[PDB]
Amino acid sequence: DLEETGRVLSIGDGIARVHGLRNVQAEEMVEFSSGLKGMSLNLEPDNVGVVVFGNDKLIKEGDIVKRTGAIVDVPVGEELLGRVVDALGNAIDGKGPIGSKARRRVGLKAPGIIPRISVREPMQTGIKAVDSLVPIGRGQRELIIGDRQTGKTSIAIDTIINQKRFNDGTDEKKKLYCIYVAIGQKRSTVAQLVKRLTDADAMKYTIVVSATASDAAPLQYLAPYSGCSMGEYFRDNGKHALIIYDDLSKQAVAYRQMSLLLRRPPGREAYPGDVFYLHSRLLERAAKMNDAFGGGSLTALPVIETQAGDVSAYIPTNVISITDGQIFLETELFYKGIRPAINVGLSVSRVGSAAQTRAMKQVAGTMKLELAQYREVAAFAQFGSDLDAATQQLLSRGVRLTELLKQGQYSPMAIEEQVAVIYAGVRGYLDKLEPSKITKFENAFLSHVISQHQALLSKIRTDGKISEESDAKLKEIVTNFLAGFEA
Amino acid sequence: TTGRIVAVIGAVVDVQFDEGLPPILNALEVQGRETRLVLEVAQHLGESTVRTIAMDGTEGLVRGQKVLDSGAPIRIPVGPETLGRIMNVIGEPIDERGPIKTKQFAAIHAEAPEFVEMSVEQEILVTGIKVVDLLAPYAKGGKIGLFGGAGVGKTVLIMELINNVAKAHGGYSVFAGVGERTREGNDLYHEMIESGVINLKDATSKVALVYGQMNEPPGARARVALTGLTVAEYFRDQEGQDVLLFIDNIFRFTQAGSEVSALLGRIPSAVGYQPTLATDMGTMQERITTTKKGSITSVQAIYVPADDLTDPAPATTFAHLDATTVLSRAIAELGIYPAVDPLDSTSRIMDPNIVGSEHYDVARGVQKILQDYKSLQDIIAILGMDELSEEDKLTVSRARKIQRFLSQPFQVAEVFTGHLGKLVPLKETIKGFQQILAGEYDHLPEQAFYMVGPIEEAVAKADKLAE
Amino acid sequence: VPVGEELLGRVVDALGNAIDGKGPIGSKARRRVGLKAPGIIPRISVREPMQTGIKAVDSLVPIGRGQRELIIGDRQTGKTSIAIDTIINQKRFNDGTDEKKKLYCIYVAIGQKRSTVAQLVKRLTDADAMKYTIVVSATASDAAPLQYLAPYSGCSMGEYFRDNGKHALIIYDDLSKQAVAYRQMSLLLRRPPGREAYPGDVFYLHSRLLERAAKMNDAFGGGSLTALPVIETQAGDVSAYIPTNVISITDGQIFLETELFYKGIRPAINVGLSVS
Amino acid sequence: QSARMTAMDNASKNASEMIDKLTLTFNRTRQAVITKELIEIISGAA
């Protein structure tokens, strides 16, 4: 039979050319005699180009290939929460079977124009620079982009860790289930990652989907889509999910391997013409649904690695254009002490204010304007000893607000804690404090207000802004605290 | 089963089998050769023909020559009898000391340890090298990479690490010479005999050697790393003791793959590399690791073609490492050795919760001052020092002293420096940079800080520089 | 190829045929051109001085017997002149009677014009240096295979001294032109090009040649072959593909620059960028 | 003070013209790198 079965003509570099299989569908998953699976990517007059899900040492010329009616799907549901799975949803944490009651296709179309509604609910990262200047709303796609070791994964991890306060709460709108997709990373890195999430008590609401460096290219190719379908379960059931794709650069590399070896025509950087289409299909599936379709959401934080800051390379260009905004990280900011290393001037969120609470919206605007005015003058901050007071004040407010955008790792902040620090710089209470002391000041200040002035922080939360009463109390605390700290 | 050679083009040999076709990765034995010639099966081309990569030269091969399927991948000697010996790609002794007195063997192709087998333990491994220890410290059982363009100091550093870490190691070491200089192999072999880490008369040898240098055809160079690491995997899994694995140079594995890629019928990827560069690297790197069964501290020298760190080969390597030491020609050119870029070297354990706040603060302080100076250099080169504020020229003078105090005379580099080698304790490294940052040596000349060990030598050098 | 002391004082082509009009070359020994380099065991550490007579080289980037030291730089920066002064330098030792201090020289010209090679030979004859020098010449109008072959053939002539307890020096002038001849052959054999249209194994072309320069232990005679390969850069870019390929083979390099040359720094050696 | 005002005005103008000249060199090189890489890829595939 050559309709539902075939025979391998040639095998090499993860590509099997198969005679027969006349009834195979484009992108259908078939089975080799060895038990290994493959996906039928090339349907040609005389052969099927099958991409192999494993080591090709177990595939030889003349091996029988079978259609099995296989559907490319993954386990889906709350049972995946706390679990580490491979690209296909198989447990790799050694904790036994996934008790999945439902399954979902990995290859599905995104919701159209109609089933959606404008993004309007905050997705809080707990990172001051992001929540204030690059705000993310539920349903949005916000790119994290930068060179190697600029702090990209850290932004994603801190965001996941931040949700614990909501997930432990009783508010049936604030929660947020997390999915971290690891593509092309080494296993020990992912192990360190899950340890971090476990110690932070974050795994209980997190699914880790991992297709690591030694996994065959098609598995790395599928992993993001597999994770997406898991998030879409929450989206389609009136719940809110966050997915991280860490990273899409590595996914593109895996797809390029397959395309080239299938002898599809190479383009810029040897990527195929459908590499944009690869990422756009994936990222358009992040969506905010209207009340008619359950009101659920999927937010995406794709990660792109640039090379020597080239945000105009092929894959960066694609994903920048697809997303709703970008958080740009830079090496020279990182080593200057700007951590997180966000370029505030270049980073953008097109959702913007619509994704912020009133408390943040009352301070983020002022901060954005003062930093913009500072950036115009900043080049001669060290070359202007005799310039006038007006531009001296812009510089003085300038690297004070910049110091207030610095933040440690693994302690994302509640919105009321963020605005209390941002307000202190904006309303001018630190203009006389030595630049180099601000980071250590804030650490001490924040510990002090959390422990002793929780009543104050609650007032900014319960009332959703800083009142005159709150303003007066914050003035007394900051000014007297400043004098003790600078000694 | 028996095949016949049907085609020979450089290192790539096509073999036809009338019957039992050998699976991919199998080792084939060419008949009628004076010395053993292994072909590794790479592809099934169809028409009962396999495409293979030769492990030695293909000169003298004839179309029609018989080839036997061994029925397995390349298998090499493992176990304690490899210690103090030198082996090649296919497991043969190359030290003129007769047979490897063993009968335990292992295939050079193996599956990487699974996710469940991973260890998250990470504690500092002090090197005595100031720049490494301060800024991007190594971890025991971690993956360490030494990046550098041609002639910037990868090998000198790896040899210094072998001197500072391996000579007082509690387990076994494996050194894999991959596509490098044979002269360096001879240097190292006789040095370890002189030090006693290799003993030619008793069984006290601590190091097993595997070599396939740049005199070998690409098949050899593509596979010697797998041979070297197979020896390491045995010592990790069947023993459970700690292993040190040194590789110079792991780039040569990827380069060898690129040398034969077009002849294997592949369309090129970017920068002339094989389309499989990243998965090839992944299947090899993911075996080089600590597991719940045993620890491997791996140190890999990584060549950077045309000094371009964005070159696909080094660029793809970064993600496989826990600590990165990046060497720079721009720095070596200044006489700053080791030529470590303090603004491009990183470590997973550079974390205040792991190294402590003191260590972390000084490291970040050093990086900040150096990045501030780097950003100023070009402005002051044109507009002049006198245009700088007092705060700026203080950061300039301190930064230049910090740059110099990161330089250090290596014991293995005495033939190059003219200075006695020095090893600096971590405590002294932290203190020294702390004091420079704090302005405690603002009164001392720049050069006092160049090419010394501890900070006390800089003070002594400053006194000597007076008269 | 023909191999032995009968080649000394003679100019030959890529196959050892006499091109100097002095008569047929009659050696008692022959040697294969494509032999593999000695492994780890036959070797011993480089420890004997190979004196160039150039202060900057001998003091700052010293060359020993059995070493490979690249000479690299743009056109007309003084590359050949380093090699020539080195050959002429050996007369002091070669006139004596101590055979372990002598150094026999081989100049391989690849892709040069014949008149340049002739002027080279006139210089070596006037300095009375030709008598201990073999000139191996595959010039610009010689077919690509001959230019590709010439370095290996010269290397085989030098390996004669190496394996018989004597010391030889070989200059490859230059390997850039050999790589170009090899690129042509490879493209025309329809082997698919790689970086800069050079064949996928352009590194291996030079690495197998240069590895054959070696210092032998006393068991193998204690002899040596020292190599000075030459690479031409474009616009002074030492950090280029083929340059760093060859830098990554040799045991150091002497880097010459036009800027230094015209400033009066002659020999035009960049100290920081040169190493031994 | 007049002479410094004068010289700095001219320097700032020279810097401006150099920024333009360098940006143009940058972008020609940027385009050439992309074109060259692609021609090597195409040649290898053909």
């Binding site: 800051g309 | 070009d378 402005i379 507009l383 | - | 700032s12 920024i19 090189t29 790198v33």
Partner: peptide
């Protein structure tokens, strides 16, 4: 010559342009 080299020069001459203008003022 090379993009990285021009990148640094460009950032340098951009800073100078601004400083020279402020110094003029």
């Amino acid at each position: 010559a090379t993009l990285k080299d021009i990148t640094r020069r460009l950032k340098s001459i951009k800073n100078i342009q601004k400083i020279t203008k402020s110094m003029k003022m």
